[PDB]
Design a protein around this ligand. Structure first.
Ligand SMILES: O=C(Cn1cc(C(=O)C(F)(F)F)c2cc(Br)ccc21)NC1CCCCCC1
Ligand SMILES: [Br-]
Length: 320
Protein backbone atom coordinates (compact mmCIF):
# COMPACT_ATOMS: atom_id res chain seq x y z
CA UNK A 1 0.00 0.00 0.00
CA UNK A 2 1.25 3.56 -0.66
CA UNK A 3 2.04 5.77 2.30
CA UNK A 4 -1.16 7.08 3.88
CA UNK A 5 -1.94 10.20 5.98
CA UNK A 6 -2.39 10.64 9.74
CA UNK A 7 -4.84 13.58 10.20
CA UNK A 8 -2.99 15.05 13.15
CA UNK A 9 0.29 15.10 11.18
CA UNK A 10 -1.20 17.26 8.41
CA UNK A 11 -1.29 21.01 7.84
CA UNK A 12 -4.93 22.09 8.09
CA UNK A 13 -6.04 25.15 6.18
CA UNK A 14 -9.20 27.21 6.37
CA UNK A 15 -10.46 29.82 3.90
CA UNK A 16 -13.65 31.83 4.39
CA UNK A 17 -15.21 32.13 0.94
CA UNK A 18 -18.28 34.01 2.21
CA UNK A 19 -19.50 35.01 5.71
CA UNK A 20 -20.45 31.68 7.36
CA UNK A 21 -18.94 29.50 4.55
CA UNK A 22 -15.40 28.32 5.40
CA UNK A 23 -13.62 25.58 3.40
CA UNK A 24 -11.13 23.29 5.13
CA UNK A 25 -8.32 21.45 3.36
CA UNK A 26 -5.09 19.69 4.10
CA UNK A 27 -1.92 20.78 2.38
CA UNK A 28 1.27 18.82 1.68
CA UNK A 29 4.22 19.34 -0.61
CA UNK A 30 5.82 22.03 -2.75
CA UNK A 31 5.43 22.57 -6.48
CA UNK A 32 2.56 23.30 -8.83
CA UNK A 33 -0.77 23.40 -6.98
CA UNK A 34 -3.03 20.36 -7.30
CA UNK A 35 -6.52 20.54 -5.73
CA UNK A 36 -8.21 17.21 -4.94
CA UNK A 37 -12.00 17.15 -4.73
CA UNK A 38 -13.75 14.12 -3.17
CA UNK A 39 -17.14 12.62 -3.80
CA UNK A 40 -20.22 11.57 -1.85
CA UNK A 41 -20.12 10.72 1.07
CA UNK A 42 -16.39 11.18 1.53
CA UNK A 43 -13.64 13.38 2.99
CA UNK A 44 -10.26 14.85 2.20
CA UNK A 45 -9.15 11.59 3.74
CA UNK A 46 -10.41 9.65 0.75
CA UNK A 47 -7.21 10.96 -0.94
CA UNK A 48 -4.99 9.61 1.86
CA UNK A 49 -3.01 7.38 -0.53
CA UNK A 50 -2.59 10.07 -3.18
CA UNK A 51 -1.56 13.01 -1.00
CA UNK A 52 1.93 11.70 -0.03
CA UNK A 53 2.59 10.27 -3.47
CA UNK A 54 1.74 13.51 -5.28
CA UNK A 55 3.74 15.57 -2.81
CA UNK A 56 6.71 13.26 -3.30
CA UNK A 57 6.36 13.56 -7.09
CA UNK A 58 6.86 17.33 -6.75
CA UNK A 59 3.36 18.84 -6.27
CA UNK A 60 1.73 21.06 -3.71
CA UNK A 61 -1.37 19.11 -2.83
CA UNK A 62 -4.52 20.74 -1.47
CA UNK A 63 -7.03 18.09 -0.47
CA UNK A 64 -10.41 19.63 0.26
CA UNK A 65 -13.27 18.87 2.57
CA UNK A 66 -15.89 19.82 0.07
CA UNK A 67 -18.75 22.04 1.20
CA UNK A 68 -21.04 20.06 3.47
CA UNK A 69 -18.27 17.82 4.80
CA UNK A 70 -15.87 17.46 7.65
CA UNK A 71 -14.49 20.73 8.96
CA UNK A 72 -15.95 22.71 6.02
CA UNK A 73 -19.19 24.62 6.57
CA UNK A 74 -22.44 22.72 6.04
CA UNK A 75 -25.34 25.18 5.69
CA UNK A 76 -28.76 23.46 5.44
CA UNK A 77 -30.12 25.18 2.34
CA UNK A 78 -30.25 23.08 -0.82
CA UNK A 79 -29.22 25.87 -3.14
CA UNK A 80 -25.92 26.32 -1.30
CA UNK A 81 -24.88 23.07 -3.02
CA UNK A 82 -25.66 23.82 -6.66
CA UNK A 83 -22.64 23.67 -8.99
CA UNK A 84 -22.80 27.32 -9.83
CA UNK A 85 -22.35 28.24 -6.16
CA UNK A 86 -19.81 25.52 -5.47
CA UNK A 87 -17.61 26.48 -8.42
CA UNK A 88 -17.73 30.16 -7.61
CA UNK A 89 -16.63 29.33 -4.07
CA UNK A 90 -13.70 27.26 -5.37
CA UNK A 91 -12.62 30.30 -7.44
CA UNK A 92 -12.83 32.44 -4.31
CA UNK A 93 -10.74 29.82 -2.56
CA UNK A 94 -7.99 30.15 -5.16
CA UNK A 95 -8.24 33.96 -4.94
CA UNK A 96 -7.77 34.05 -1.19
CA UNK A 97 -4.85 31.60 -1.39
CA UNK A 98 -3.32 33.79 -4.07
CA UNK A 99 -3.27 30.99 -6.66
CA UNK A 100 -3.78 32.00 -10.27
CA UNK A 101 -4.45 28.41 -11.30
CA UNK A 102 -4.47 24.91 -9.96
CA UNK A 103 -4.73 21.45 -11.41
CA UNK A 104 -8.14 20.14 -10.36
CA UNK A 105 -8.58 16.40 -9.76
CA UNK A 106 -12.02 15.15 -8.71
CA UNK A 107 -13.82 11.92 -8.03
CA UNK A 108 -17.58 11.31 -8.13
CA UNK A 109 -19.39 14.61 -7.31
CA UNK A 110 -15.96 16.21 -7.07
CA UNK A 111 -15.37 14.99 -10.63
CA UNK A 112 -18.52 16.71 -11.75
CA UNK A 113 -17.32 19.86 -10.02
CA UNK A 114 -13.91 19.88 -11.70
CA UNK A 115 -15.49 19.47 -15.14
CA UNK A 116 -17.70 22.47 -14.37
CA UNK A 117 -14.58 24.40 -13.22
CA UNK A 118 -12.78 23.58 -16.47
CA UNK A 119 -15.79 24.62 -18.51
CA UNK A 120 -16.69 27.89 -16.75
CA UNK A 121 -13.33 28.92 -15.22
CA UNK A 122 -10.66 27.59 -17.62
CA UNK A 123 -8.42 30.49 -16.80
CA UNK A 124 -8.14 29.18 -13.22
CA UNK A 125 -7.78 25.50 -14.15
CA UNK A 126 -4.30 24.55 -15.33
CA UNK A 127 -5.44 20.98 -16.11
CA UNK A 128 -8.37 18.80 -15.10
CA UNK A 129 -8.72 15.14 -14.23
CA UNK A 130 -11.75 13.08 -13.18
CA UNK A 131 -11.96 9.67 -11.61
CA UNK A 132 -15.09 7.78 -12.71
CA UNK A 133 -17.28 10.80 -13.43
CA UNK A 134 -17.63 11.57 -17.16
CA UNK A 135 -18.26 14.88 -18.85
CA UNK A 136 -21.72 14.78 -20.45
CA UNK A 137 -22.97 18.02 -22.06
CA UNK A 138 -26.37 19.09 -20.83
CA UNK A 139 -29.19 18.21 -23.22
CA UNK A 140 -31.60 21.18 -23.20
CA UNK A 141 -34.33 18.97 -24.67
CA UNK A 142 -34.43 16.60 -21.67
CA UNK A 143 -35.29 17.29 -18.02
CA UNK A 144 -32.85 15.88 -15.44
CA UNK A 145 -35.80 13.96 -13.96
CA UNK A 146 -36.26 12.18 -17.30
CA UNK A 147 -32.55 11.34 -17.58
CA UNK A 148 -32.37 9.91 -14.03
CA UNK A 149 -35.57 7.89 -14.49
CA UNK A 150 -34.12 6.54 -17.78
CA UNK A 151 -31.29 4.64 -16.02
CA UNK A 152 -32.14 1.92 -13.42
CA UNK A 153 -28.84 2.24 -11.56
CA UNK A 154 -29.60 5.93 -10.77
CA UNK A 155 -32.74 4.98 -8.72
CA UNK A 156 -31.00 5.79 -5.43
CA UNK A 157 -30.79 9.39 -6.68
CA UNK A 158 -34.58 9.62 -6.52
CA UNK A 159 -34.48 8.26 -2.97
CA UNK A 160 -32.02 11.05 -2.16
CA UNK A 161 -34.39 13.82 -3.30
CA UNK A 162 -36.83 14.21 -0.39
CA UNK A 163 -35.06 16.15 2.37
CA UNK A 164 -34.74 14.20 5.64
CA UNK A 165 -35.34 10.70 4.39
CA UNK A 166 -31.86 9.58 3.34
CA UNK A 167 -30.36 11.70 6.10
CA UNK A 168 -32.09 9.72 8.82
CA UNK A 169 -31.16 6.38 7.30
CA UNK A 170 -27.49 7.28 6.73
CA UNK A 171 -27.13 8.86 10.19
CA UNK A 172 -28.86 6.07 12.12
CA UNK A 173 -25.69 3.96 12.51
CA UNK A 174 -22.64 5.68 11.04
CA UNK A 175 -20.33 2.66 11.39
CA UNK A 176 -22.92 0.55 9.55
CA UNK A 177 -23.27 3.22 6.88
CA UNK A 178 -19.56 3.45 6.05
CA UNK A 179 -18.87 -0.28 6.35
CA UNK A 180 -21.78 -0.89 3.98
CA UNK A 181 -20.71 1.70 1.42
CA UNK A 182 -16.93 1.38 1.34
CA UNK A 183 -16.56 -2.06 -0.22
CA UNK A 184 -14.96 -3.57 -3.28
CA UNK A 185 -17.31 -4.43 -6.16
CA UNK A 186 -17.20 -8.15 -5.34
CA UNK A 187 -17.97 -7.37 -1.66
CA UNK A 188 -21.04 -5.21 -2.36
CA UNK A 189 -24.04 -5.57 0.00
CA UNK A 190 -26.19 -2.91 -1.78
CA UNK A 191 -28.04 -2.54 -5.09
CA UNK A 192 -28.40 1.08 -6.32
CA UNK A 193 -31.17 0.09 -8.76
CA UNK A 194 -33.61 -1.29 -6.17
CA UNK A 195 -33.77 1.48 -3.54
CA UNK A 196 -37.06 3.37 -3.72
CA UNK A 197 -39.02 0.10 -4.03
CA UNK A 198 -37.17 -1.34 -1.02
CA UNK A 199 -37.67 1.79 1.10
CA UNK A 200 -33.98 2.66 1.64
CA UNK A 201 -30.33 1.80 1.00
CA UNK A 202 -29.84 -0.63 3.87
CA UNK A 203 -33.22 -2.34 4.23
CA UNK A 204 -31.86 -5.62 2.80
CA UNK A 205 -28.22 -5.27 3.94
CA UNK A 206 -26.51 -6.66 7.08
CA UNK A 207 -27.15 -4.94 10.37
CA UNK A 208 -23.51 -5.72 11.25
CA UNK A 209 -21.55 -5.67 7.98
CA UNK A 210 -18.08 -7.14 7.80
CA UNK A 211 -15.14 -4.90 7.16
CA UNK A 212 -14.14 -4.61 3.48
CA UNK A 213 -10.65 -5.73 2.56
CA UNK A 214 -10.16 -2.14 1.34
CA UNK A 215 -10.37 -0.45 4.76
CA UNK A 216 -9.43 -0.80 8.42
CA UNK A 217 -11.65 -0.26 11.45
CA UNK A 218 -9.61 2.85 12.29
CA UNK A 219 -10.24 4.29 8.82
CA UNK A 220 -14.01 3.67 9.16
CA UNK A 221 -13.98 5.36 12.54
CA UNK A 222 -12.39 8.47 11.02
CA UNK A 223 -15.35 8.79 8.65
CA UNK A 224 -17.75 8.16 11.53
CA UNK A 225 -16.19 10.97 13.53
CA UNK A 226 -16.28 13.37 10.59
CA UNK A 227 -19.96 12.76 9.87
CA UNK A 228 -21.00 13.29 13.50
CA UNK A 229 -20.13 17.02 12.90
CA UNK A 230 -22.77 17.92 10.28
CA UNK A 231 -24.36 14.64 9.22
CA UNK A 232 -25.61 13.97 5.73
CA UNK A 233 -27.89 16.90 4.89
CA UNK A 234 -25.23 19.01 3.20
CA UNK A 235 -23.73 16.02 1.41
CA UNK A 236 -27.15 14.91 0.16
CA UNK A 237 -27.94 18.43 -0.97
CA UNK A 238 -25.35 17.93 -3.75
CA UNK A 239 -27.97 15.64 -5.32
CA UNK A 240 -30.90 18.09 -4.91
CA UNK A 241 -29.99 20.72 -7.52
CA UNK A 242 -30.48 18.66 -10.68
CA UNK A 243 -32.67 21.25 -12.47
CA UNK A 244 -30.62 24.21 -11.33
CA UNK A 245 -27.40 22.52 -12.43
CA UNK A 246 -28.85 21.59 -15.81
CA UNK A 247 -29.96 25.18 -16.42
CA UNK A 248 -26.47 26.46 -15.59
CA UNK A 249 -24.78 23.82 -17.73
CA UNK A 250 -26.93 24.69 -20.75
CA UNK A 251 -25.27 28.15 -20.71
CA UNK A 252 -21.91 26.53 -21.60
CA UNK A 253 -23.21 24.53 -24.52
CA UNK A 254 -20.94 24.39 -27.53
CA UNK A 255 -17.78 25.28 -25.59
CA UNK A 256 -14.93 22.77 -25.81
CA UNK A 257 -12.47 22.02 -23.07
CA UNK A 258 -9.02 22.72 -24.49
CA UNK A 259 -6.90 22.66 -21.34
CA UNK A 260 -5.14 19.36 -20.59
CA UNK A 261 -7.71 16.79 -19.45
CA UNK A 262 -7.65 13.24 -18.13
CA UNK A 263 -10.59 10.82 -17.69
CA UNK A 264 -9.95 7.76 -15.56
CA UNK A 265 -12.53 4.97 -15.75
CA UNK A 266 -13.07 2.15 -13.29
CA UNK A 267 -14.07 -1.25 -14.72
CA UNK A 268 -16.29 -2.32 -11.80
CA UNK A 269 -18.03 0.98 -11.00
CA UNK A 270 -21.56 -0.17 -11.79
CA UNK A 271 -23.09 3.33 -11.59
CA UNK A 272 -20.41 5.47 -13.25
CA UNK A 273 -19.68 2.84 -15.86
CA UNK A 274 -16.75 3.32 -18.22
CA UNK A 275 -19.01 3.45 -21.27
CA UNK A 276 -20.68 6.61 -19.90
CA UNK A 277 -17.44 8.41 -20.86
CA UNK A 278 -17.41 7.15 -24.46
CA UNK A 279 -18.21 10.31 -26.36
CA UNK A 280 -16.10 12.76 -24.40
CA UNK A 281 -13.55 13.40 -27.16
CA UNK A 282 -16.36 15.17 -29.06
CA UNK A 283 -16.09 17.99 -26.52
CA UNK A 284 -12.56 17.49 -25.22
CA UNK A 285 -10.60 16.75 -28.37
CA UNK A 286 -7.26 16.10 -26.74
CA UNK A 287 -8.60 14.14 -23.77
CA UNK A 288 -6.23 11.56 -22.35
CA UNK A 289 -7.41 8.44 -20.56
CA UNK A 290 -6.60 5.88 -17.91
CA UNK A 291 -8.56 2.77 -17.11
CA UNK A 292 -8.31 0.70 -13.96
CA UNK A 293 -9.32 -2.94 -13.97
CA UNK A 294 -10.72 -4.73 -10.95
CA UNK A 295 -11.70 -1.35 -9.53
CA UNK A 296 -15.06 -0.31 -8.19
CA UNK A 297 -16.53 3.05 -7.26
CA UNK A 298 -14.12 3.84 -4.44
CA UNK A 299 -11.24 4.28 -6.86
CA UNK A 300 -8.65 5.89 -4.64
CA UNK A 301 -8.75 3.26 -1.94
CA UNK A 302 -9.53 0.29 -4.16
CA UNK A 303 -6.54 0.79 -6.46
CA UNK A 304 -4.37 3.48 -4.89
CA UNK A 305 -1.14 2.45 -6.55
CA UNK A 306 -2.70 2.50 -10.00
CA UNK A 307 -4.39 5.84 -9.39
CA UNK A 308 -1.07 7.27 -8.26
CA UNK A 309 0.79 5.99 -11.32
CA UNK A 310 -1.85 7.31 -13.73
CA UNK A 311 -2.07 10.73 -12.10
CA UNK A 312 1.69 11.20 -11.84
CA UNK A 313 2.31 10.11 -15.43
CA UNK A 314 -0.32 12.56 -16.62
CA UNK A 315 0.79 15.41 -14.36
CA UNK A 316 4.40 15.10 -15.42
CA UNK A 317 3.47 15.04 -19.16
CA UNK A 318 0.17 16.06 -20.80
CA UNK A 319 -0.83 18.39 -17.92
CA UNK A 320 2.40 20.48 -18.29
O1 LIG B 1 -24.19 9.03 -6.51
C1 LIG B 1 -22.97 9.09 -6.59
C2 LIG B 1 -22.09 8.50 -5.50
N1 LIG B 1 -22.49 7.18 -5.09
C3 LIG B 1 -23.12 6.89 -3.93
C4 LIG B 1 -23.26 5.52 -3.81
C5 LIG B 1 -23.87 4.83 -2.71
O2 LIG B 1 -23.73 3.63 -2.52
C6 LIG B 1 -24.62 5.65 -1.69
F1 LIG B 1 -25.37 4.88 -0.90
F2 LIG B 1 -23.75 6.32 -0.94
F3 LIG B 1 -25.40 6.56 -2.25
C7 LIG B 1 -22.64 4.93 -4.98
C8 LIG B 1 -22.45 3.62 -5.41
C9 LIG B 1 -21.77 3.46 -6.59
BR1 LIG B 1 -21.42 1.71 -7.23
C10 LIG B 1 -21.32 4.51 -7.37
C11 LIG B 1 -21.52 5.80 -6.96
C12 LIG B 1 -22.16 6.00 -5.74
N2 LIG B 1 -22.37 9.75 -7.54
C13 LIG B 1 -22.91 10.54 -8.65
C14 LIG B 1 -23.11 9.59 -9.82
C15 LIG B 1 -24.06 10.11 -10.89
C16 LIG B 1 -23.70 11.37 -11.66
C17 LIG B 1 -22.38 12.07 -11.38
C18 LIG B 1 -22.26 12.69 -10.00
C19 LIG B 1 -21.92 11.73 -8.89
BR1 LIG C 1 -19.91 -0.84 -8.28
Amino acid sequence: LPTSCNPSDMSHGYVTVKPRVRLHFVELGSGPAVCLCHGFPESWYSWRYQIPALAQAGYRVLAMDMKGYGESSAPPEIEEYCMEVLCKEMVTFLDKLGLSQAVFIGHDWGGMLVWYMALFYPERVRAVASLNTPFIPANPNMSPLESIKANPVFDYQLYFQEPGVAEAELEQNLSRTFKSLFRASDESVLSMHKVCEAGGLFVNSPEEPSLSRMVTEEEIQFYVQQFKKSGFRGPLNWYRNMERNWKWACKSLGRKILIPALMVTAEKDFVLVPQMSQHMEDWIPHLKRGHIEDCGHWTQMDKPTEVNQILIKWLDSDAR
